[PDB]
Design a protein around this ligand. Structure first.
Ligand SMILES: *C(=O)CCCC[C@@H]1SC[C@@H]2NC(=O)N[C@@H]21
Lengths: 192, 84
């Protein structure tokens, strides 16, 4: 609805409704009703101002750093918590770098949260790509980022660089198959 | 000019200390004062918001000190373990 639409959210239904006037296909819904909802959610949203993201404008640079529109406000709160409020433009920049570092992957939950965590981590410590190319520095990487190189989240299409992956997990290494077909069922009875 | 009368750091260059890398809270301490430690060994479990860094062993030796208990708050570049 209009007042919960736009920017990192999805397009306004109210706006789309009128946009199709004249064009072959119309949107099947209630105009006046969505208007009525919009006014309601316009006021209710006012309760949640403290959680509003730092975007007030469309940004075309999202075509560069491919940050999910759902992760955005969630990750802002994360940076805000980790002493990285104000320094969130640098978190977006690294996010782009963390992607091409991983062989151009799909960034959604939780793979976005891995890139998300790798980005927040490397900014925190002023690390970069060549900080681990001939280096391969032991660093105590976050849960998600080592988890990903173990394959706990699956396999990316292009995989990981053999030598890249190695220096991020030295010891108990990678698993190949989809986690399910070795991970043994939970005993729900002992949980009860 | 008159003066009006009203946590340890770490090192990231030479010696093998263990500085905090994400600022947050300590969840679990596994390593004592005097104890043997081998390679890759987990030592200290610290937690952020949606983040969990379990601190491993970069070398292979004996613990000199522990600088955090249970539930202690850490900043980035803070001493935790010093190791030879
Ligand atoms: C904290 O407990 C709320 C979850 C915040 C993380 C969410 S999960 C889906 C989005 N994708 C992502 O990488 N982070 C966002």
């Amino acid at each position: 609805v209009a007042s919960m639409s736009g920017l990192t959210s999805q397009p306004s239904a109210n706006s789309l409704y009128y946009a199709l006037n004249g064009f072959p296909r119309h949107l099947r819904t209630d105009i006046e009703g969505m208007e009525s909802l919009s006014h309601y959610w316009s006021t209710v949203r006012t309760y949640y101002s403290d959680f509003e993201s730092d975007i007030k404008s469309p940004n075309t640079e999202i075509y560069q750093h491919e940050m999910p529109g759902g992760q955005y406000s969630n990750l802002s709160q994360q940076a805000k918590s980790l002493g990285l409020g104000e320094r969130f433009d640098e978190v977006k920049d690294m996010y782009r770098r963390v992607n091409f570092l991983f062989g151009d992957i799909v960034k959604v939950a939780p793979s976005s949260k891995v890139v998300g965590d790798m980005a927040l981590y490397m900014v925190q410590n002023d690390l970069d790509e060549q900080s681990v190319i001939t280096d391969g520095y032991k660093l105590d990487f976050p849960e998600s980022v080592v988890s990903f190189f173990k394959g706990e989240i699956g396999q990316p299409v292009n995989g990981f660089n053999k030598d890249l992956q190695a220096v991020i997990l030295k010891g108990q290494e990678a698993l190949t198959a989809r986690p399910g077909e070795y991970l043994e069922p939970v005993d729900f009875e002992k949980v009860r | 000019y008159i003066k009006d009368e009203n946590k340890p750091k770490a090192d990231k260059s030479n010696p093998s200390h263990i500085g905090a890398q994400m600022p947050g809270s300590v969840t679990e301490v596994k390593v004592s004062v005097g104890e043997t430690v081998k390679a890759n060994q987990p030592l200290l479990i610290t937690e952020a918001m949606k983040m969990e860094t379990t601190i491993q062993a970069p070398f292979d030796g004996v613990i000199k000190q522990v600088t955090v208990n249970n539930g202690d708050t850490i900043a980035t570049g803070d001493l935790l373990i010093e190791i030879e």
